[PDB]
């Protein structure tokens, strides 16, 4: 094959890999293309391997604490170090999983960060819209403990 | 009590609400009264939040809230929610809206960043001979014979 054609198919292989990888994580039809089948075959083949490395990567990746603004530099360093001592099909799959896990940890950092934005939405709205005074006049938040 | 004290406790009531609701969504004792309130409100209406799950998930996907328009939409919806009355149920509804809104905002973020990571993988495999390595071995489809 051509080295250009492989790169174009990789986008389709990685999307399917992230899909079927996520689907077998959630739960734990046939793809409409060959690259979609490849990404699916690679996700299911090593399901048992990715789980034994699950606790390790979940802890180490939360140590790295990757964000949207530093995700590229960490991907370049880690990917480079991954293939420095050789390239085999297993390390290619590992590159796919790293992109999968990296995207997960980036937007767990984002949601937790945005959940603080929404928290300020609620606090300020209840303050400036008498919702807090409504609850204050009825005995504070603790009053809701008698519901149910 | 004063509405100032209520606003300060709301941040802790909402954080606990998002916590214990999520825990029951996927799947001790709080260390304070406000943490218990957010927990009491989350478990009391689990079956109600479940019957409204498909409707709010579809409607919020229609809204397509982002981090840059989440405040405009939160202020309009909260105002319209309390325009025709304030009761304890509508207060709980405001908490759930903040919970779902933060989720749908970063469903948009994950899919958006999954395209950033995709460009990471494609470009790295291109500029680091990984694509040529697989191309010289028969393209992505060759990986379909792994696993037999």
């Amino acid at each position: 094959m051509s080295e250009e054609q492989v790169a174009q198919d990789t986008e389709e292989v990685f999307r399917s890999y992230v899909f079927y990888r996520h689907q077998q994580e959630q739960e734990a039809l046939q793809p409409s293309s060959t690259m979609g089948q490849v990404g699916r075959q690679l996700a299911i083949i090593g399901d048992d391997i990715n789980r034994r490395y699950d606790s390790e990567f979940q802890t180490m990746l939360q140590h790295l604490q990757p964000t949207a603004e530093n995700a590229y530099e960490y991907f370049t360093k880690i990917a480079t170090s991954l293939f420095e001592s050789g390239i085999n099909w297993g390390r290619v799959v590992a590159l796919l999983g790293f992109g999968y896990r990296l995207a997960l940890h980036v937007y767990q950092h984002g949601l937790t960060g945005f959940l603080g934005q929404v928290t300020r939405f609620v606090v300020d709205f209840m303050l400036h819209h008498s919702i807090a005074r409504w609850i204050a006049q009825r005995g504070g938040w603790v009053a809701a403990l008698n519901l149910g | 009590m004063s509405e100032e004290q209520v606003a300060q406790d709301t941040e802790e009531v909402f954080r606990s609400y998002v916590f214990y609701r999520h825990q029951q969504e996927q799947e001790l004792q709080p260390s304070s009264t406000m943490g218990q309130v957010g927990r009491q409100l989350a478990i009391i209406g689990d079956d109600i939040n479940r019957r409204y799950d498909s409707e709010f998930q579809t409607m919020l996907q229609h809204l397509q809230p982002t981090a840059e328009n989440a405040y405009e939409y939160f202020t309009k919806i909260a105002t319209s929610l309390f325009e025709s009355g304030i009761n304890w149920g509508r207060v709980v509804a405001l908490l759930g809206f903040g919970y779902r809104l933060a989720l749908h905002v970063y469903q948009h973020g994950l899919t958006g960043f999954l395209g950033q990571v995709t460009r990471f993988v494609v470009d790295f495999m291109l500029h680091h001979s990984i694509a040529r390595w697989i191309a010289q071995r028969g393209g992505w489809v060759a990986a379909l014979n792994l696993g037999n």
Partner: peptide
Amino acid sequence: SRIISRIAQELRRXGDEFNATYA
């Protein structure tokens, strides 16, 4: 030691084990 170096390492045995049981 370094976190970046440790993650790249665990990706290697990652793939090498995968490559050993499927390639």
